[PDB]
Design a binder for this molecule. Structure first.
Ligand SMILES: C[C@@H]1O[C@@H](O[C@H]2[C@H](O)[C@@H](O)[C@H](O)O[C@@H]2C(=O)O)[C@H](O)[C@H](O)[C@H]1O
Ligand code: NAG
Length: 435
């Protein structure tokens, strides 16, 4: 008896034409999140150019039934708010709370918060007409909470276990910024300020994501000294037992309410500046409470993706991810993600190849200490930082990935790729070959 995680089927949809420009303006590493399943429906958000004709860029939201059968994508366009900042840093983050309300935050680079929410719980009480008037107008504050809401970059949403939704983001800028958390009550529709949880000391933290399991909130970050990406140093870790009010390091030592970038009690690996480690890559809490970080560095003597593992007993390991035919990325190459199956035995590396203009779905196993990376699938013709649907992977065993293609405008499309997983038990029965 042995078990193998397998891809039963592979399908794709082209959900739009990518926006014109030199910069990547869809499918970017720090989007949290872009593709979300809530009950029977999958939701996606991305920027599209206005159909008439080229100046205006709008937030677009798709939904499709994914249960109990997969239906067609349909779209609404939020054509009341044109995007002021179409540079590298302004991508959409989307979240869905336990009252079925859909939250959007977008169009940020050191500007005041941009936020909007559905009038109603449209993911719980599902409307049949999918139109832009489902969403309230854009606001620059969080009702019931307090700023500072400026200068804001990188809205990240994290659904908690009780229907509530965290919103996290940087205030200040590159090489001088603080990180704040706000909590939405699904129960009241009010935000409360959890305040500054990381204080920059003439630098800023860049978090890899927010992960939640059994009452515990996990995060990991590097520290950036200046606006130049070469000036990232350190891989840090902390977790909260009260959804981001109170924080503890890997040794379970409680921390000062604002964590300082200067305090190395949170440091879990020494990575100096100019190690070619990029900010805002990937992390994961697997369903067995093991914590993962995806970064990269050239420290081994080669540029390679690095897997940091925090084994449940507080002990850390670092192991390069070098499966056959994966080109190791440099500082400015597309950033990847880690996903986990419901069982918690199978770890997926969703790793864009820096040369091949494709994204690899690699799998490793807890049994073999996550050192057994196998190529399981490949998304071809991508120039993207892959983003996936953690809810749909957990509750349907389907790995659903938002990608931006490689190539020029207008050939370059936005797509969703669905890899139907099949965990196979193998019985090998010895049988008679005798006369
Ligand atoms: C590596 C780079 O980091 C973030 O963008 C930075 C960027 O380094 C630079 O223009 C300046 O530092 O502004 C940005 C900032 O204030 O954060 C983003 O993660 C980019 O996608 C990434 O390329
Ligand atoms: C605290 O954590 C670091 C790893 O982050 C480790 O090197 C050190 O041994 C730990 N110290 C204590 C007192 O547990």
């Amino acid at each position: 008896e042995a078990e193998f995680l397998t891809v039963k089927s592979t399908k794709q949809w082209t959900i739009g034409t990518d926006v014109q420009g030199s910069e990547r303006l869809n499918g970017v590493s720090y989007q949290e999140d872009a593709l979300i399943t809530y009950g029977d429906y999958q939701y996606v958000t991305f920027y599209e150019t206005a159909p008439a004709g080229y100046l205006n860029h709008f937030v677009k939201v798709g939904r499709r039934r994914v249960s109990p059968s997969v239906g067609d994508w349909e779209f609404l366009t939020l054509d009341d708010y044109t995007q002021k900042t179409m540079d590298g840093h302004n991508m959409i983050s989307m979240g869905i709370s336990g009252d079925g309300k859909i939250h959007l935050s977008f169009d940020h680079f050191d500007v005041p918060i941009n936020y909007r929410i559905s009038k109603n719980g449209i993911a719980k009480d599902v409307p049949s007409k999918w139109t832009s008037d489902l969403f309230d107008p854009v606001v620059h504050e969080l009702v019931g909470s307090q700023g500072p809401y400026s200068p804001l970059t990188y809205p990240r949403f994290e659904p908690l276990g009780n229907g509530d939704l965290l919103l996290e983001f940087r205030i200040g800028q590159s090489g001088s910024g603080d990180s704040y958390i706000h909590r939405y009550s699904a129960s009241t529709g009010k935000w409360q300020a959890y305040g500054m949880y990381i204080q920059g000391d003439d630098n800023n933290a860049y978090i890899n994501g927010l992960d939640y399991l059994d009452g515990k909130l996990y995060t990991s970050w590097t520290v950036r000294e200046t606006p130049n990406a070469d000036t990232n140093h350190g891989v840090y870790f902390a977790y909260s037992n009260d959804d981001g009010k109170t924080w503890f390091n890997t040794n379970d030592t409680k921390l000062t309410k604002p964590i300082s970038t200067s305090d190395d009690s949170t440091l879990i690996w020494d990575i100096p500046q100019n190690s070619r480690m990029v900010n805002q890559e990937g992390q994961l809490i697997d369903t067995k409470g093991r914590f993962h970080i995806l970064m990269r560095d050239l420290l081994s003597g080669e540029h390679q993706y690095q897997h940091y593992l925090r084994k449940a007993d507080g002990t850390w390991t670092k192991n390069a991810i070098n499966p056959a035919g994966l080109n190791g990325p440099d500082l400015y190459d597309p950033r990847g993600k880690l996903a986990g199956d419901a069982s918690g035995e199978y770890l997926f590396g969703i790793l864009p190849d820096p040369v091949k203009q494709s994204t690899g779905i690699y799998v490793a196993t807890a049994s073999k200490d996550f050192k057994d990376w196998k190529s399981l699938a490949e998304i071809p013709n991508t120039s993207t930082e892959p983003l996936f649907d953690k809810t749909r992977l957990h509750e349907s065993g389907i790995l659903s990935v938002f990608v931006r293609q490689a190539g020029g405008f207008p050939d370059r499309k936005l797509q969703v790729w669905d890899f139907e997983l099949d965990l196979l038990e193998q019985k090998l029965i010895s049988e008679e070959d005798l006369n």
